[PDB]
Amino acid sequence: GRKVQSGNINAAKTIADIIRTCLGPKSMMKMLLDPMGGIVMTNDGNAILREIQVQHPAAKSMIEISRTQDEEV
Amino acid sequence: SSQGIPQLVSNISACQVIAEAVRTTLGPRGMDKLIVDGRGKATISNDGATILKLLDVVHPAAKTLVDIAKSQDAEVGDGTTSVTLLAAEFLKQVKPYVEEGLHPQIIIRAFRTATQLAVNKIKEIAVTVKKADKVEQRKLLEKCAMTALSSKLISQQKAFFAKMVVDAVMMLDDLLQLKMIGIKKVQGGALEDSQLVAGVAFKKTFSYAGFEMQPKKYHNPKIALLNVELELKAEKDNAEIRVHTVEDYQAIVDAEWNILYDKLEKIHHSGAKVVLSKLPIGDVATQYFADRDMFCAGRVPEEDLKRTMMACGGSIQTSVNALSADVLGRCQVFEETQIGGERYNFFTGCPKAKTCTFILRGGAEQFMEETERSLHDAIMIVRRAIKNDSVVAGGGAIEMELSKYLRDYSRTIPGKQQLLIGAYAKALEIIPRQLCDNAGFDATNILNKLRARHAQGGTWYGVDINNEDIADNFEAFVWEPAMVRINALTAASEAACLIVSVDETIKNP
Amino acid sequence: ALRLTEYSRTLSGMESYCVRAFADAMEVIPSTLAENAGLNPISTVTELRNRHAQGEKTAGINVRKGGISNILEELVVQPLLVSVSALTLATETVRSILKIDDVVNT
Amino acid sequence: TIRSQNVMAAASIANIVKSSLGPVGLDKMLVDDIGDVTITNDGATILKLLEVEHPAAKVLCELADLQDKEVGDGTTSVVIIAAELLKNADELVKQKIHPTSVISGYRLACKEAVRYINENLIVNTDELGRDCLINAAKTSMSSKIIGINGDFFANMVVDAVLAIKYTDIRGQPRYPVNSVNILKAHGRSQMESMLISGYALNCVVGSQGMPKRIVNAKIACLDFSLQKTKMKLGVQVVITDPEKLDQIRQRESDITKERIQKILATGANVILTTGGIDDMCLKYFVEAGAMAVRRVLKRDLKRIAKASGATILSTLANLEGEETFEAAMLGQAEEVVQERICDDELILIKNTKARTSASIILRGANDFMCDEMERSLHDALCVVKRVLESKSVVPGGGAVEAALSIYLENYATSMGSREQLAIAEFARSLLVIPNTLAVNAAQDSTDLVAKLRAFHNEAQVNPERKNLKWIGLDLSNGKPRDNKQAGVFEPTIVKVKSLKFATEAAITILRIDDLI
Amino acid sequence: LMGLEALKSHIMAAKAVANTMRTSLGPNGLDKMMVDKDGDVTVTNDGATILSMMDVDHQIAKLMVELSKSQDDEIGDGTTGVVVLAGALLEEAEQLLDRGIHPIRIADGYEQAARVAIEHLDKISDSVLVDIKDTEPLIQTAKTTLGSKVVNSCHRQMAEIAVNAVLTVADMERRDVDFELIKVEGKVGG
Amino acid sequence: EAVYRNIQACKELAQTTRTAYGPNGMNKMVINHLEKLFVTNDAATILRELEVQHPAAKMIVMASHMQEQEVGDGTNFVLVFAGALLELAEELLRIGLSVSEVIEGYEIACRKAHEILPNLVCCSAKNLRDIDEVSSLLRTSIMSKQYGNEVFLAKLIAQACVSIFPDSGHFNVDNIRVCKILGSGISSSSVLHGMVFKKETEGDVTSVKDAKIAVYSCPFDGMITETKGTVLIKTAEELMNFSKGEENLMDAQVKAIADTGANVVVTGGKVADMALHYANKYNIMLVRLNSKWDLRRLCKTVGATALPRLTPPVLEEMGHCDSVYLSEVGDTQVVVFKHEKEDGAISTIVLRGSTDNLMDDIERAVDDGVNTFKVLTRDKRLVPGGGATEIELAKQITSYGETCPGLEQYAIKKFAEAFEAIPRALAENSGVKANEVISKLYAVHQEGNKNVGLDIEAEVPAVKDMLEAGILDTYLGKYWAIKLATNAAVTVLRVDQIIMAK
Ligand SMILES: Nc1ncnc2c1ncn2[C@@H]1O[C@H](COP(=O)(O)OP(=O)(O)O)[C@@H](O)[C@H]1O
């Protein structure tokens, strides 16, 4: 249980906590605060994933494997 | 540093801190210690037990370490520092292993198993070199002692100390004795004159008269011991009422000295000849003894007083009166002789036989201020040679035998315990390592030589204390008794396991 | 170092003490050759001094091993000119260096 | 902190590459640049890719890459062994041991260790492998077991490697792993698989108007392809002739009657031809008997050329058929069968001369698991090939690093000089390979290294137990196994050079004193 | 605190003692001024008197001054010589420790150095003629040794009285005497 | 928030107390307000010194004290098990379940455990004679506190208890006292009928028949109510005159006050050695160097009572005994008072050892052994221990949780996992990784063996049957341990805030 796996898990938990509310017919709206000043609304998780900033390399690799998932199906 | 591994690391670090204050002291020619604490006064000592007693062990791990180490009492050999350093180096060699997340109880089991195997190995290989019938064992006791002090200049006086130590073997024949080891410091003259005298000897005498006017061949003197002063009356006493009785100014102390004269008559017809006391005695009293067939030997330290009272089988008095009883014994002969530059006193024989001593000349400080520790240790050596049946080669030779046996038996054990047994065997190496380091010449080379000389051939090889290179410590009669080393090694192992097996130290304010 | 310590003993003035210091300085190179071998420098240098003070005027540290074995065969040898040039050039350099009080800019 | 600054950097590199030493090791994310995310678990790749920042790490990785370029793949073993040597050497130096004494120690330890391995720890392939290769392949299968299967595949691969034994100069008969004609097949009972001597092609089915249904004496190769169309070399349309534009192909087809006469004179009755040849062009040779087989591809071409010696471009140079055909490109063999096996009409060239290749039909229900067994069996073929490389092999799974640790420990006390403590410290350092292989398994390193080292000491001290020389950890498990009766093997040359280069690295980086 | 650095600190304390005893030995030595808390001031060349009240600064200096004080009856003139010689021993010992030698080995090297020093020193000089009877070369010795330091002028009388006093008591104890029987009574006024 | 704080405090308390659980428990340093330093592995003492200032910690500690005063073993089981309850309740609350649901689930799970555990028992204690059998029954409790040297203490305790356990089905807790005279060798210990003392003033025992005891911490007078006589230490000659006086008063005691019950006077303060000689001449003994608890014990076991200051003796504080005689057990003088059930019901052992720390370790071992004997006498059925019973309960509670639909099942499952925490506590102390051994124990235990547990002796995590191995706890001990542990857990969980009042 080294710190690197803990960081991997923490990044996965953060991104999954962001995405969770987008599941189901009653899914929540999400807020995208582009530092230019505008806001992008979204209902589903792929749209928020395509432009969410992930500075942590673990979350970035999670995004890459999500890209690998979504390109297939 | 709260629970488990961090707290154990803190405890073993404290053990290392308290060990470094004693590790340098280990060895016969140990690099000694200076302690200032206790009243702001200096003291110099080359004994691990002494420096541990005078230093205060505030830390709990150090507290229990020194308690269990001194519980072995190290009366026979310098075992306090050996036990302390073995325990500390067990902890040192297991520090990384407990640090990497090793449960502190399998290590306790490892220490117990390794110690049991080491004890069995020592008892199996210890040689019972003591033939009882043949009396000429002196011809090897003398060699053992002279080699225990082979470092200093021994042209022919080696034989004199040899005869001293062996005749002291038959002189401390009965039981384990503590006065016998002290030797009276003498200043001036050559070192040739060194002869045994029974009983006790006393320090520098004052300029009191009666040195020979009353012959110093007291035959069967009854012994007197004192704890109350007889003093001069130079201080003035006031009596001013009238001038008719100018003699009354001194009659007040004349009455006191008449009472003391009655007490001295009580002593005189009680048969007591020589009076011992802790405190200086007035000159007038000294001449009273000189005239009245008795003698003054006061202002002597209490160690000689307990020495003499257990010589005579009596007790202290804490009084000047009520001495007309068997509270004191009867020595055969008292003599006082001018030896070198100072007049000394003697009680040869006394009534009992557990009391004797020896006279040490040489006209120097170096070799005899050394003696007060070195021949202390050397007649201790011969006492281990006499009164312990089996012996094993000292100077770390047995430590290398264990560092080989326990290490290979570790590499034999299948379980994870084997690595810990190997660390244990490595920790045994500190005694030759530290003993070599305190002798100055580099420890690493000597340890490599000991490693390579073991595992093939003779096992008795160890550090040659007198020289730089290696030698058979057993052949040089530098022995350590089997039983005492079993107790020391077991005590060190118990100290190590007791330190390892404790979690947080808790205290309530 | 041995013979020149003897010479400084026979010499007079502060020059004698300085020549003794010359010998004590030069004993560094055998010490550091030992300190680049397995042997501890101090024991090696004192052993070499004792050997040269007991005859055996050629003893040192070789390359084929680390111990003091230079009686013959495995001994490492050089033409003296390299050593005497080392001495002469180093002595001239230290003469120049101590010959200085200050370094001035033009 | 002038030498420890180098030792700690090397130890950090070892710590990074450590968690991926064995086949069960973890994955490493290496990013030499932003966004270039890479995930590999073989330490050699990360060492080639990890951007070291300290010159000690620079030189250690340079020596690791030099070892990789020299022989084998033991780069990981080199790095961890060398850096553990460095950590323990710095521990020795902290104990006032002089650095060059440790240098001489490690040098002599490496020499004596190489001697020990060469003289009593190598086991020879001419003694080994008659049956043990079956269980070695089983161990290779253990990584990707997909059911009760695996024992039959072990017999399959061992019989193949015996059959595909590449008789060659220097008496070192190993085969190229890619040569074998492994073939995935669906609609099959996947727990069987047949092996047939001779290479196999991407055989034509459902269009064989050519009567390849009968046995052939010899096969002829052809990487040309006569065509009505400008898809391949030799066909041109720039000619200014309404006839010649079409009958260039017809003239070539009539000229190839000479070529088929040549192949018949050589011994061939069927000629195989690469893609792009017309089926109506195949009819011309079907009518004359020397029929032509379509759809053989570049991999088929290279397999045919390397196995049967069918060097098509040996004497034939232009696309025209007027040039000389001879045995220089004949598919030299004894006979060629085209039997319908498992609803597939595979073409098998029995007893291919100048290289006796074989064909593998990998029976499997689905594409993904077919590719998975292909990968696993390729790994098994590679591991048995690596065993066969050196003609002499040592027990893998860390048995050597453990056994050799005990011998170096014993041989340290054999000598008195200061180097022997370095000998001993190296002996205990070399156990890092068993330690790492154990850590990479869920079973703790201490207990398993202890059991391993005790077994090896039993082999060293109880001479009756000489078969105990080679118990090591299972690479893909956490128990000590007899690594000849079963288990993995690794070539003696690659690991002895691994130890040698590890020691040379530990000398070159430890003789450093300061950077100025 | 511990080890060789602590021994270097001890060496610095010894140098503190040695450098102040350095200027005092010999007839031309520089005297110190001794001041007590009462403020009394006295100048003296005698190293023993200087060390009699030299207060501790770090403890090992107190230990060594007590060691030097303990031999005043036998050491005689040159006790400050003892102190400066030991200080030089420690000063060069610091260089030896810089060279890396363990302290006990330079210690036993110094004891064998003292041994060879004693062996050579027994052979260094000749013997004066008889003491008890003639006493005239002994008068010359006492003049050229004692009256040169600080007394207003060297003259025969103090030396002659001292040698007469000792020879009245010198021969009984096999050519030996104890100073318990000889004392000084200082009484200013003449 | 405060719930999580209380759970964290109790978690750290249970963690710092857990390391001493099991036979191979880890010792700890103890520094009480007497500043004496000793190492121990006993929950009772380690908590009695540890200032648990957190009120929840104090609640669990006093629940442990109530468990200890009701039943001997399990005082550390209560701590570790309540800690497990609170950690798993913190997990449930982090999931989001309310305190009410988890406490009600813990209550129903405790009721189920108390209902099913009597079915869990596998053996019952036979007759308490046959010192071998009762030794085998004390085996687990004796090994629990001290390890490495265990059979000797079991035999010692068995002999001590059986030699005094009456024919009636009753036995008293304040029966076995301990005497801790120093000396080499633990194995040199022995048992004596009645009470013994370590060492006192010398004397020739004349009270060997019809022994009676007086006890004074006041001037050594001992006059009868019908006369006046006293000793006043102001001058020597009349001090001897008094010494004669109160020696004659002691003679008058052994003559007439013996009918009330006074022959030998117990002195709290030291008396002159010459007065000891007079006591020798006139045939009266005495005892000296006794702590106030020693006087209390001696007087209560004879029916007497210590007098703080001078008062003529009356029947209200007289002591009765059968014999006062002497033995040199361990080569050292020890006095003994022997009874024939006139009062009796007391037996005392002598503790032998080279250190007061080991002396206290033996003391706690003896206390836990005698308390185990207590709880065995009134409940002769007793439970297979060493992790076996906790895991059998854990499996049963897991089955019950799967049997209970809806909510309350979280608390049932976590209560079973709290059971699971016990062999984890054994595993961490025994040097074996907890997860592997607990999983292997489930593997061998869900098969129905029902008596498997953590094998300490194996260096590798493994299991063995504790029934034939001799590791087995008391039924009532574990029953009340779990009962008050769950009571403490449910009470502490029912505190959502820590509030101060004046
Ligand atoms: N030989 C043993 N093996 C395994 N566990 C034991 C053994 N002996 C005792 N135990 C455990 O220890 C418990 C009792 O000891 P412990 O709780 O540590 O101290 P105390 O009895 O004072 O509360 C028992 O309930 C049992 O679970």
Residue D494, phi then psi, degrees to nearest 5: -65, -40
Question: Which residue is catalytic, options D159, D278, D379, D482?
Answer: D379
Architecture category of domain D197-390 in CATH:
3-Layer(bba) Sandwich (3.50)
E176/B42 touch (CB, cutoff 8 Å), yes or no: no
Touching check for F15 and chain B: CB below 8 Å? yes
Look at the block and give the residue holding tokens 């082979």. Answer: B150
Cα separation, F296 vs F303, whole angstroms: 10
How many A from CA of F25 to the centre of ligand 1?
Answer: 9
Widest Cα–Cα separation across chain E: 61
Other CB atoms within 10 Å distance of the CB of residue C53? 13
Q: Give me the sign of the Cα torsion angle F204, F206, F209, F212.
A: negative
CA distances from D53 to B283, D56, D506 (A): 90, 9, 19
Q: Which residues pair with D360 in a beta bridge?
A: D182, D195
E176 interaction partners in chain B (CB closer than 8 Å)? 188, 341
User: Atom of ligand 1 at shortest distance to CA of F20?
Assistant: 18
Give ∠ CA D493-D498-D502 in degrees, rounded to 5. 150
What per-residue string of b and e applies to B357-384 under the rule 16 or more CB within 10 Å gives b?
Answer: bbbbbbeeeebbebbebbbbbbbbbbbb
B439 interaction partners in chain E (CB closer than 8 Å)? 104
Cα separation, B72 vs B91, whole angstroms: 20
Cα separation, F399 vs F403, whole angstroms: 6
Q: Is A30 helix (H, G, I), strand (E, B) or coil?
A: strand
Parallel, antiparallel or unpaired: strands F212-216 and F319-320: antiparallel
Count B/C contacts: CB-CB distance under 8 Å. 3
- Report how far apart the first and last C-alpha atoms of chain B are (Å, whole number): 19
Cα separation, D95 vs D93, whole angstroms: 5
Answer yes or no: are the C-beta atoms of F171 and F140 closer than 8 Å.
no
* Neighbouring residues of F34: CB distance < 8 A, sequence distance ≥ 6: none
Q: Is F272 helix (H, G, I), strand (E, B) or coil?
A: coil
Cα separation, D32 vs D46, whole angstroms: 10
Parallel, antiparallel or unpaired: strands F212-216 and F264-267: parallel
D412/B451 touch (CB, cutoff 8 Å), yes or no: yes
Q: Which residues pair with F179 in a beta bridge?
A: F350
Residue B122 identity? I
CA distances from B346 to B268, B274, B357 (A): 21, 11, 10
SS (H, E, C) A53-67: CCCCHHHHHHHHHHH
Tell me if E42 is assigned to a ligand binding site.
Answer: no
How many A from CA of F59 to the centre of ligand 1?
Answer: 22
Cα separation, B193 vs D493, whole angstroms: 78
CA distances from B59 to B10, B12, B16, F30, F346 (A): 10, 11, 12, 13, 42
SS (H, E, C) D249-275: HHHHHHHHHHHHHHHHHHCEEEEEEEC
Parallel, antiparallel or unpaired: strands F264-267 and D330-331: unpaired
D37 interaction partners in chain A (CB closer than 8 Å)? 57, 60-61, 64
How many A from CA of F23 to the centre of ligand 1?
Answer: 6
Answer yes or no: are the C-beta atoms of B157 and B194 closer than 8 Å.
yes
Answer yes or no: are the C-beta atoms of E96 and E106 closer than 8 Å.
yes
CA distances from B185 to B172, B335, B344, D295, E19 (A): 20, 18, 11, 115, 34
Q: Helix crossing, E3-21 with E79-98: angle to 10°? A: 150
User: Atom of ligand 1 at shortest distance to CA of F80?
Assistant: 17
Resolution, given in Å to one decimal, reads 3.8
F31/B498 touch (CB, cutoff 8 Å), yes or no: no
Q: Could you tell me the residue range of the domain that residue B216 belongs to?
A: 197-361
Q: Which residues of B are part of the catalytic machinery?
A: 47, 80-81, 377
* Minimum distance, in Å, between the CA of residue D98 and any CA atom of chain C: 6
Which residue's CA is minimally distant from atom 21 of ligand 1?
Answer: F73
Name the residue among D404, D465, D427, D432 with its Cα closest to residue D116. Answer: D404
What per-residue string of b and e applies to D360-395 under the rule 16 or more CB within 10 Å gives b?
Answer: bbbbbeeeebbeebbebbebbbebbebbbbbbbbbb
Q: Is B217 helix (H, G, I), strand (E, B) or coil?
A: coil
Answer yes or no: are the C-beta atoms of D400 and D484 closer than 8 Å.
no
D100/C37 touch (CB, cutoff 8 Å), yes or no: yes
The pair of structure tokens assigned to F116 is 């099913």
92-111 in chain B: CB under 8 A from chain F: 103-109
Question: Which residue is catalytic, options D42, D90, D300, D474?
Answer: D42
Widest Cα–Cα separation across chain A: 41
User: Which contiguous run of DSSP H or E holds residue F191?
Assistant: strand F190-193
Smallest CA–CA distance from C40 into chain D, residue: D98
* Neighbouring residues of D349: CB distance < 8 A, sequence distance ≥ 6: D198, D199, D219, D308, D331, D333, D336
Q: Which residues pair with D182 in a beta bridge?
A: D360
CA distances from D351 to D194, D303, D307, D354 (A): 16, 14, 10, 9
SS (H, E, C) F60-101: HHHHHHHHHHHCCCCHHHHHHHHHHHHHHHHHHHHHCCCHHH
Cα separation, D101 vs C66, whole angstroms: 9
Answer yes or no: are the C-beta atoms of F264 and F207 closer than 8 Å.
yes
What per-residue string of b and e applies to D504-516 under the rule 16 or more CB within 10 Å gives b?
Answer: bbbbbbbebeeee
E59/B31 touch (CB, cutoff 8 Å), yes or no: no
Touching check for C4 and chain D: CB below 8 Å? no
Task: Let me know if D139 is exposed, middle or buried by CB neighbors in 10 A (0-12, 13-18, 19+).
Answer: buried
* Structural method: cryo-EM
Name the residue among D449, D452, D455 with its Cα closest to residue D467. Answer: D455
